[PDB]
Design a protein around this ligand. Structure first.
Ligand code: M7G
Ligand code: M7G
Ligand code: SAH
Ligand code: SAH
Ligand code: MG
Ligand code: MG
Ligand code: ZN
Ligand code: ZN
Ligand code: ZN
Ligand code: ZN
Lengths: 126, 293, 293, 126
RNA sequence: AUU
RNA sequence: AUU
């Protein structure tokens, strides 16, 4: 079978694809592969989701669509804004978590003030 | 120094020959290059192609129109489209297309045979990576191929703005004589081989600054024979050095002037500006493109 | 992945042969590599040497003692010493030396023939880049060379601490049978060719963890013949990929234990600790070295 | 003649070698060459003179001794402290000035508070 | 051709 | 060998 077909089908079948993927991961499943990592200078702002690659020395920049569970499963997005935040942009993933960018974008949230990943660059609270 | 360039362009000395078509026999054929860790083959390839395009006189207008055929892949994603979107100025309309469904960062994604793509709009840049899988099948003679190439030759002639550019992927067996002839309708042209895939007969026929009329007469069969001869006699070592400095990668937005075509208004000043990447001639309304069959 | 390594080590398969000495005929002999802009050949070469040393079990004590022969150059500076100073832990005593005057970043610089260098102290690391210019002169047969090699063979046997290491530069014609034979007095050894100078017969004979006694019996003449055979039959492409990531370049200071030698105290546990880079055996007083003649 | 022989001899001959070199430069002389540039990550603190290369993205790191006029001329140093600040260390030179590191270290001064080149990284005053 |  |  082609790569990722099983997990993408399993998630697309569920009513809550995010929960389906998180449960798949908690049972030891291999994370979704073939997220598109870009070449960049790694001297960027480090913000979470940007129009061009903005990885700093501790991040990797990926094509946004390839890191979106709903994009990858070809299912409708539940985003309250009515559109995807990732498709057409670039997502910065901490290098330690770059083995599962889809899981990272699912499990984390962007600070609406500074634009950094909450818990991975945002220091507004402290 | 050649290993530090994004790739190698066909010298004019080899364009001017009149060779017979030979079988392509690359010294390093099939060899794989080691890329930066975790980088896809096509991210590297498209990055080198864009690095080379950076050295040409591409027109870069406000509200640029770029279309990318063959953007899908067996992985279900579109690395080439991601590289193009990184490269092109912000706000550039990027439309991609492929026979099979895929996920993309383009503004619109058109699924279906490229012949089902319809639009009234003209485009500023045409990138094609299309390749017919049945090309791999053994054949008696290496003849000019039709299929999508046919469509492509129509598109360039009908939907490419004057001053626009193209990069069309070809190989030893995936080629078309009329596309080579159309290359002579540009201010400049070449066959460009990326350094990361120099072990392949793949090249990109690059036409820079479309003129809409034959500036150079080109025999496509002879020219593909010339390309094969050049590849056979000039081996290229796999190299990914140019991928280590991305500081100058984004396409420089020069705000190229855009104007509408009038009846027989192409005076020599217009040809000059077109050939220097200083003018795009087309209408500039909202783009409407579809592959609905 | 060979192009991404700092260089290539002589396979064990080739050390165990019994070849006769032949002429070295490298396919790419003399070819020049393009380095990062403004980087000297010796900065690249010494950086790759240190990158390879990073993969071995070098003892790294507090107050390390490193000596570097052949550190001068026709430019009047010492790029190799600058690389060593970047690589070695802060506070490491770095002493370099050369026949001709030069400016260096070492703690002490000793000018004169290496045979004029005197010291009571033992050393933890010996780097030698020495090369006799007259080696270039045409000769009838490629015989074992004396000169500085003689001195070097004495130094290793008299002034190298147990557990210490060496890297001695040799070429097709700049070699010494006794140095090869001494390579068998270390826990591990190899001949290492940097990727940036793979078009040369130059290599670094690396001895890792000195044992003070013959662990492996080596015929120096036969082993140099084996090295030449390996170089002749295994061409290496020039490569500087490993130079693009310096994030893990500094030698890891692991605080290797230092102890003084006593009469017949070399039990097998001590050999175990010596062979893993876990022990340096020498006194640890202030170093006093000079080349005053 | 070997490279730099003329200028190094001319500077070593004068009582004030710094003035001799600055006059040589002001008359159009070619700057001293073969300052030893190091490979580094360019993610360093950017300080002027450090024990290891500390270039940032706008600097290059050189072996300190090769960038010292007095070291290069084999003449005595006039440093009031009695020793050379450059020999044995690494000097960060702004990339725009990396064509003449000896001239740069001659013409400029290090902030004793923050350790940056005054006018090329020091922001203590502003 | 999607190394 | 100091490309
Ligand atoms: O991607 P390619 O470089 O293989 O070009 P292609 O797909 O158009 O060629 C199809 C078939 O030709 C055979 N073959 C092609 N080329 C260029 C070579 C070559 O250089 N050396 C050898 N030994 N065979 C070649 C392949 O079977 C290829 O599938
Ligand atoms: O630095 P080198 O690699 O030249 O080694 P060397 O100085 O010890 O050799 C001295 C002379 O030998 C001749 N020669 C050496 N090597 C290794 C080659 C070779 O590989 N291919 C040819 N055609 N000649 C070689 C040189 O004259 C060299 O100066
Ligand atoms: N007539 C046609 N119409 C549309 N797509 C076609 C086509 N003939 C071939 N193709 C497409 O050409 C593609 C070649 S694979 C291209 C890989 C892609 N450029 C990347 O970025 O990875 C295939 O996806 C195939 O479906
Ligand atoms: N017997 C000897 N004693 C001391 N130095 C010697 C020597 N024979 C040769 N040399 C020195 O060996 C050096 C080889 S050139 C070495 C270049 C140096 N590693 C660099 O970093 O650039 C020459 O400078 C030469 O003077
Ligand atoms: Mg290939
Ligand atoms: Mg060389
Ligand atoms: Zn999405
Ligand atoms: Zn915040
Ligand atoms: Zn000095
Ligand atoms: Zn300051």
């Amino acid at each position: 079978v082609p790569a990722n077909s099983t997990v993408l089908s399993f998630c697309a079948f569920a009513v809550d694809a995010a929960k389906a993927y998180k449960d798949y991961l908690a049972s030891g499943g291999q994370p979704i592969t073939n997220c598109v990592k870009m070449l960049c200078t790694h001297t960027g702002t480090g913000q979470a989701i940007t129009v061009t690659p903005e990885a700093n020395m501790d991040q990797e920049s990926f094509g946004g669509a390839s890191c979106c569970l709903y994009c990858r499963c070809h299912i409708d997005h539940p985003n309250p804004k009515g559109f995807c935040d990732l498709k057409g942009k670039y997502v910065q993933i901490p290098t330690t978590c770059a083995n599962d960018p889809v899981g990272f974008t699912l499990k984390n949230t962007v600070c609406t003030v500074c634009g950094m990943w909450k818990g991975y660059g945002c220091s507004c609270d402290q | 120094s050649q290993a530090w360039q994004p790739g190698v362009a066909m010298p004019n000395l080899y364009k001017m020959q009149r060779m017979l078509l030979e079988k392509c026999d690359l010294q390093n054929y099939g060899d794989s290059a080691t890329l930066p860790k975790g980088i896809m083959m096509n991210v590297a390839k498209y990055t080198q192609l864009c690095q080379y395009l950076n050295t040409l006189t591409l027109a870069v207008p406000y509200n640029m129109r770029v279309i990318h055929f063959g953007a899908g892949s067996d992985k279900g994603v579109a690395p080439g489209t991601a590289v193009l979107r990184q490269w092109l100025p912000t706000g550039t309309l990027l439309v991609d297309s492929d026979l099979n469904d895929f996920v993309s960062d383009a503004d619109s994604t058109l699924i279906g045979d490229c012949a089902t793509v319809h639009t009234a709009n003209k485009w500023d840049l045409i990138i094609s990576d299309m390749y017919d899988p049945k090309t791999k099948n053994v054949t008696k003679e290496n003849d000019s191929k039709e299929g999508f190439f046919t469509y492509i030759c129509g598109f360039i002639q009908q939907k490419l703005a004057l001053g626009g550019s193209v990069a069309i992927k070809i190989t030893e067996h995936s080629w078309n004589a009329d596309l080579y002839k159309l290359m002579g309708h540009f201010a400049w042209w070449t066959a460009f081989v990326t350094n990361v895939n120099a072990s392949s007969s793949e090249a990109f026929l690059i036409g820079c600054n479309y003129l809409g009329k034959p500036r150079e007469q080109i025999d496509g069969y002879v020219m593909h024979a010339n390309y094969i001869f050049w590849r056979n006699t000039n081996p290229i070592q796999l190299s990914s050095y140019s991928l280590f400095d991305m500081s100058k990668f984004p396409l420089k937005l020069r705000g190229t002037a855009v104007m509408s075509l009038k009846e027989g208004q192409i005076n020599d000043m217009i040809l000059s500006l077109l050939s220097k990447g200083r003018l795009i001639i087309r209408e500039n309304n909202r783009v409407v493109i579809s592959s609905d069959v």
